[PDB]
Chains A and B, each alone.
Chain A
Amino acid sequence: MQIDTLINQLPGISTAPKHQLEKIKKLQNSIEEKQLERKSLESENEDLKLQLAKRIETFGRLSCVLFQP
């Protein structure tokens, strides 16, 4: 009887794999388009963030002059 409940629990109750693959098509339509953006982010980020951190580095170095007058 539990098996019957297990029958209820079986994934893809809609039993429409042909539609499921289409769902996966929509998933590509989402994910794959997301990928270029999400990858573009780091390029839009760290590429400048390094240099800006270096700009912090300059002031950090010049602090030492005051530290040792």
Chain B
Amino acid sequence: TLLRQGIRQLKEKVSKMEPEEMTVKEKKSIIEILKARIALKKAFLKMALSESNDTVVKKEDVRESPVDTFMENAT
């Protein structure tokens, strides 16, 4: 959510080789502070990631195969 594109919006905000960047980054870090708590909202972990999710989708891919078998026998 906000953690995603918030990085995208903070990312372009860097400007000038001069150390004025902090004046921008102070606006960033506060959001990041919120992110530190926004991340708390997302303190969950069901599935790991890939490839386990891919294994799930493939698991249905075999599990959807019978549907074109016995159901065909129904017809």
Contacts and interface: CB of A to CB of B under 8 A. Distances in A.
SS of A interface (majority): helix
Classify chain B's interface size: under 10
Contacts of A66: 66, 69-70
Nearest to B67: A66
A17 to B, nearest CB: 63
B2 to A, nearest CB: 43
B62 interface: yes
B56 to A, nearest CB: 15
Interface of B: 62, 66, 69-70, 73
7 contacts: A59-B70, A59-B73, A63-B70, A66-B66, A66-B69, A66-B70, A69-B62
